[PDB]
């Protein structure tokens, strides 16, 4: 079945960044926004992190291993913007992969979106319309 958020729901995506990202439709609408600003790799990295911590722990060493290859490696295709400190700490823990290894990296990319991307989202048309098409 389709998922058409109500007025309130859409309205509360602007209460705090976590509300917008903890909602599947929020993220989905937020992704259409990042795609336009060419920074969708951040939301992808975030999800990937969740799927690692809260996913089948049987293939962690497998996931992290490929996450590094897709988002962290130099010149990686979905290369994310993290600092050198945060990057070394990460490449270190990836020598003994586990669930909460991307914590530092994830917290970083989280705030990156929160302070820069998010702000511009609540102002974009992609949000005004989402709100205009709100139920009751």
């Amino acid at each position: 079945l389709v998922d058409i958020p109500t007025k309130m729901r859409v309205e509360r995506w602007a209460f705090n960044f976590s509300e917008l990202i903890r909602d599947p439709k929020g993220r989905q609408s937020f992704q259409h926004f990042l795609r336009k600003e060419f920074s969708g790799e951040n939301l992808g990295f975030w999800e990937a992190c969740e799927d690692l911590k809260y996913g089948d722990q049987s293939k962690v060493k497998e996931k992290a291993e490929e996450i590094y290859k897709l988002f962290l490696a130099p010149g990686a295709r979905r290369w994310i913007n993290i600092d050198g400190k945060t990057m070394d700490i990460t490449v270190k823990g990836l020598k003994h992969p586990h669930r909460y290894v991307l914590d530092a990296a994830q917290t970083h990319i989280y705030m990156l979106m929160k302070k820069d991307s998010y702000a511009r989202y609540l102002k974009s048309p992609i949000y005004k319309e989402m709100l205009a098409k709100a139920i009751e």
């Binding site: 920074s39 010149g75 994310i80 050198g84 990057m87 820069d116």
Partner: protein, 318 residues
């Protein structure tokens, strides 16, 4: 007529700050509600700034002026992980103000080039009391001084001298540059920012790399690109105000060992200017203009952008 403008430059060179001035000068500036949305960003920079200084104390093995301050430091680190992001409780600003007045904290602050500190650290920290005064509302300069790492590509549009400017602001960190290629088509002019004060700093991406060398490698690659031979390239030697101060205490020989001129704004400033302009392979046919700028200074920016606009206007009628 329309004009596509590109704001390029390494991370933390001043790009987004220019965007903010365009909004202040050709877009009716900020409203009260917008100004207020920066309070949290300002409290965020402030905290992150004092935290870095504090951590540097042990990293650089510097000791507090007064030993008591050690507890204040520890309690600050704690409150950092428990309070709500982007706020500044009385008990916190009280701790920050006491550390700031410490002679050892100042000694570490003076050595900011030895670690990673925000440009605006001293701006906010110096006047924390004003920032946490009930009824506080950011001033333009407070907004201009705010720091937010930008990711991706963002367009902002405004009209000026009967020209529709389509200005594109990008991210400067290495990982963001691979995305620049998406805007190279139809570039009327490129404003390239260079942090004059980066000569004794290292990159956030790699603390082994000097920030200006990184900047030189970047500009070298940009100004020499098939996609811009018919594009106006203006160089913004930025952060003059910060640069004219540290050049008095920190020798430019740290960036250029061969520099033998005096360490003064004028001489060192021009030396840096030359090293960048001399990266051009075809300056024979294509000239690169350059202005010494302070992106946080609205008058300087309004002036410089007027000149940039004339260049555009003139290179067009040819």
């Amino acid at each position: 007529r329309t004009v596509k403008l590109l704001l390029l430059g390494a991370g933390e060179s001043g790009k987004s700050t220019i965007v903010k001035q365009m909004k202040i000068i050709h877009q009716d500036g900020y409203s009260l509600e917008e100004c207020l949305e920066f309070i949290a960003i300002i409290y965020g920079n402030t905290l992150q700034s004092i935290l870095a200084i504090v951590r540097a104390m042990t990293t650089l093995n510097i000791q507090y002026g007064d030993s008591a301050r050690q507890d204040d430091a520890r309690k600050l680190m704690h409150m950092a992980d428990t309070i709500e992001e982007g706020t500044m409780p009385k008990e916190m600003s009280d701790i920050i103000q006491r550390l700031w007045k410490d002679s050892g904290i100042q000694a570490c602050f003076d050595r900011a080039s030895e670690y990673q500190l925000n440009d605006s650290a001293g701006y906010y920290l110096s006047d924390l009391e004003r920032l946490v005064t009930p009824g506080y509302v950011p001033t333009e300069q407070d907004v201009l001084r705010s720091r937010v790492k930008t990711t991706g590509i963002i367009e902002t549009q405004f009209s000026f001298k009967d020209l529709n400017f389509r200005m594109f602001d990008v991210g400067g960190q290495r990982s963001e540059r691979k995305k620049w290629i998406h805007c190279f088509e139809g570039v009327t002019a490129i404003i390239f920012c260079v942090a004059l004060s980066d000569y004794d700093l290292v990159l956030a991406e790699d603390e082994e790399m000097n920030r200006m060398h990184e900047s030189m490698k970047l500009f070298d690659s940009i100004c020499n690109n098939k996609w811009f031979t018919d594009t106006s390239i203006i160089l913004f030697l930025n952060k003059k105000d910060l640069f004219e101060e540290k050049i008095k205490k920190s020798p430019l020989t740290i960036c250029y060992p061969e520099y033998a001129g005096s360490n003064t704004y004028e001489e060192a400033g021009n030396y840096i200017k030359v090293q960048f302009l001399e990266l051009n392979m075809r300056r024979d046919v294509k000239e690169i203009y350059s202005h010494m700028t302070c992106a946080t200074d609205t008058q300087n920016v309004k002036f410089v952008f007027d000149a940039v606009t004339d260049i555009i206007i003139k290179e067009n009628l040819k």
